[PDB]
Design a protein around this ligand. Structure first.
Ligand SMILES: Cc1[nH]nc2c1[C@](c1cc(F)cc(N3CCC(CCC(=O)O)CC3)c1)(C(C)C)C(C#N)=C(N)O2
Ligand SMILES: Cc1[nH]nc2c1[C@](c1cc(F)cc(N3CCC(CCC(=O)O)CC3)c1)(C(C)C)C(C#N)=C(N)O2
Ligand SMILES: Cc1ncc(COP(=O)(O)O)c(CNCC(=O)O)c1O
Ligand SMILES: Cc1ncc(COP(=O)(O)O)c(CNCC(=O)O)c1O
Ligand SMILES: [Cl-]
Lengths: 442, 442
């Protein structure tokens, strides 16, 4: 008693929008630092009937039976996850059930400190995530600032984490957890100095490595696993998995953390896991551990350095004047345009990026930069020499944005009226589409 | 720079477990009340490249651009959801971003009451969900009992909601929310009498209709939308959608609820939505509104009534002695076997069901029943006539479970040793497989 007609027939309306979406992804220079493109195998897992199964609890200790094949999948994912990040299953544990990055972090934090517990994280405006305690005078914006007592540390006026301030804060504030690893931080993290600070005050070290997961995995950047009690990571960004998350916990530094984290995920916060996700995460974690994927990750950094260099060559300023990873933050103050305006301009030429705060921005209202990253375009096959063209297109959008602002004014709603029909944008869009539409597409 | 070899090639190990899972689904009598089988269209959406896109925020008010086609999908889903549940988009709103039922409920509750807020729900042992405030003497098991102050109301000795007890509790406890709609409740709900008690104390009315959603949509059961301030539902049980959830909120009764709920979902709790889910939910919410799906739903009730009847004909006792919906709870006290033992026995014959508490069970340690339901098998094409066979197989499993307990004793570890090799189980397994394997399978 069901309709098994294909998507095209069953729902032509939805199917057109999805074919349109696919064409827009195919014809876009995607510079969203947090985005990537999943291969066919990962997407086959996500559409697999394994998502029909309710399997609350953990492998073996399920509430229901009929979960023998689901237990192998979930155990195969855990194993492949510990292998990928070069950790011993005797020393480290992993929970593979969190539905996404934000859930993973709220659950893990709750395990460690509970309700009313004290946490420290980087401010959102300085490159921290919402789930690192974000609030503002007017509201406890994140649940992590409300169900916990959070305090927030800032980067210095050059974009770097200020460890002297972290200590000043940790000593007086006395948190049970300090969060490092960030959403728009263009440099590597000194986890050892974090570990040193946490020991001093008795707090846990929480490393959220969602943006830099592949680099840690492939030993191209510092290893938080040497110093951290907990590591969380999304699986959908540079790692190139599905939309999901992983929580890692250091059993040796903290026996009985295994039970706190697993119970926090279920039954404290979640119900039934999403086994299609777990299958998909398994499939990608095998690719992660090949030598092929290390080649890819290295290309991400090569492309990002080259992109950094070419933008500097065209006199564009970058936060910290460079990058040690996949992402760059462009400081747009010298052109007197906001990041929102350039985001719209770039949207009109099929260039995907996001507006992003810089150290000088007091508020998160009207951010003065944009963030770009290379994982997506590196997946689509761009090499070092391709970065001069992206740098060229970005330079040309900044110039056009400046022209349009002069003509139409500095109000965002007035600015946008200039965008449609603009001859240079149409020319530039066309140039973007021709280069983008040609690149390999999974 | 990626590997596009198909799943079989890329990962043969995983592909075999998944093909084994599919074989086990096809050769199982699935009586899990909360499970169903998604069609090919829903599973095409789930594997769509739309999950590559980060689209934090809500349609139009997005944080990034490039979200034109994602905005159409998310607006199409919202529209189709309001249509399906016969609500006016002027009077009701819907959030389509919650990743699953439990997330949906924690976010909705938080919107309404905040941290430390007071809530009331059905106890887990009496058929409530974990996210309805479940705790026990030893621990606050759900975050809903910890981040909130919860109190729990029990059903009476016959398994009915005791409204006189809800008022006894609501008047002294003074909660800000009262939760109704349940996980293993075999009867319909008097929402009007709940709306009467909530008005009396000034609490909100929260209806979690995850298990009975299709009935509510098709006007086969009472309509909580006439009385409730908030309605939540999962999309993957009787509704037959993907794994996701919907939060509905009553603008008319509570202006300013819209912002509270949307802000609770993001950015309080979640990050980026999962657009493959949203697409899939859209795809199914179209099927839901057809007269065909109302036929399916009606059949679920016909099968459940017939199943109830046939088990009573074989002298098996049901909690409340019957059912008004898709599910039955079987009381196993007269056979002196636990639900856990019958769940193992049934797993051995490819019968999927779960252990479930009954009113007499003081604790959750030894549940004295099993819960069964018909949506899955009704999807696979079973009619009223076929329920005698299911009832026969379940009676035969109960008998075998009684035999095995006599021989090996009442310890579960001992009981299980009797299971492998048992001739009648192998015989009954084979009967189940032969009938199950034949049935239509999406
Ligand atoms: C959307 C989002 N999520 N997490 C982020 C962001 C980032 C961001 C950029 C931006 F321009 C604005 C914002 N917000 C501004 C304040 C918002 C508060 C909304 C509310 O009060 O409900 C929360 C999101 C957040 C980008 C990576 C997209 C950000 C920055 N800068 C940082 N650090 O992290
Ligand atoms: C697994 C689960 N989730 N939500 C449920 C259940 C049900 C359930 C059945 C059952 F036999 C046991 C349980 N639990 C017993 C207590 C458990 C506490 C675990 C902990 O201490 O962390 C949580 C799950 C929960 C079934 C529908 C499967 C249940 C019942 N009875 C009710 N009412 O709702
Ligand atoms: C450090 C960090 N942690 C957690 C998350 C949450 O992921 P979910 O969206 O899966 O909840 C993000 C995503 N940040 C968005 C971006 O950088 O574009 C992140 O950057
Ligand atoms: C009434 C109710 N609400 C919320 C949920 C949570 O759904 P997720 O598993 O998607 O978090 C359930 C799960 N029902 C479990 C069962 O009956 O088998 C439920 O029964
Ligand atoms: Cl999914």
């Amino acid at each position: 008693m069901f309709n098994n007609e294909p998507l095209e027939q069953i729902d032509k309306e939805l199917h057109d929008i999805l074919a349109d979406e696919e064409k827009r992804q195919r014809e876009t220079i995607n510079l969203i630092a947090s985005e990537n493109l999943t291969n066919g195998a990962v997407r086959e897992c996500l559409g697999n009937r394994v998502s029909n199964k309710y399997s609350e609890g953990y492998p073996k200790k399920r509430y229901y039976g009929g979960n023998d094949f689901i237990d192998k999948i979930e155990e195969l994912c855990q194993k492949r996850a510990l292998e990928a990040f070069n950790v011993s299953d005797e020393e480290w544990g992993v929970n593979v059930q969190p539905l996404s990055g934000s859930a993973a972090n709220v659950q893990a934090l709750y395990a460690l400190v509970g309700v009313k517990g004290k946490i420290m994280g980087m401010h959102l405006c300085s490159g921290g995530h919402l789930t690192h305690g974000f609030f503002d005078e007017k509201k406890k914006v994140s649940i992590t600032s409300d169900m916990f007592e959070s305090k927030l540390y800032k980067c210095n006026s050059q974009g770097y984490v200020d460890l002297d301030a972290v200590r000043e804060m940790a000593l007086s504030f006395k948190p049970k957890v300090i969060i490092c690893g960030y959403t728009s931080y263009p440099r590597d993290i000194d986890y050892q100095q974090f570990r040193q600070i946490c020991d001093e005050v008795n707090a846990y070290l929480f490393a959220d490595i969602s943006h830099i997961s592949s680099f840690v995995a492939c030993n191209i950047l510092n290893n938080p696993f040497l110093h951290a009690d907990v590591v969380t990571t999304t699986t959908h960004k540079i790692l190139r998995g599905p939309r999901s998350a992983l929580i890692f916990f250091n059993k040796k530094r903290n026996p009985g953390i295994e039970q706190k984290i697993n119970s926090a995920v279920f039954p404290s916060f979640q119900g039934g896991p999403h086994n299609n996700k777990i299958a998909a995460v398994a499939c990608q974690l095998k690719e992660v551990h090949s030598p092929a994927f290390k080649e890819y990750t290295q290309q991400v950094l090569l492309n990002s350095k080259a992109l950094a260099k070419a933008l500097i060559s065209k006199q564009i300023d970058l936060v910290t004047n460079g990058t040690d990873n996949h992402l760059i933050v462009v400081d747009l103050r010298k052109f007197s345009i906001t990041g929102s305006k350039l985001q719209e301009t770039c949207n009109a030429i099929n260039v995907s990026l996001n507006k992003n705060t810089i150290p000088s921005d007091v508020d998160c209202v009207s951010p003065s930069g944009v963030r770009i990253g290379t994982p997506a375009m590196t997946t689509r096959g761009a090499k070092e020499k391709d970065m001069e063209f992206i740098a060229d297109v970005l330079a040309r959008a900044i110039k056009i944005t400046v022209d349009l602002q002069e003509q139409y004014g500095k109000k965002l709603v007035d600015f946008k009226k200039g965008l449609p029909g603009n001859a240079q944008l149409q020319q530039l869009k066309q140039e973007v589409v021709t280069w983008a539409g040609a690149l390999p597409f999974p």
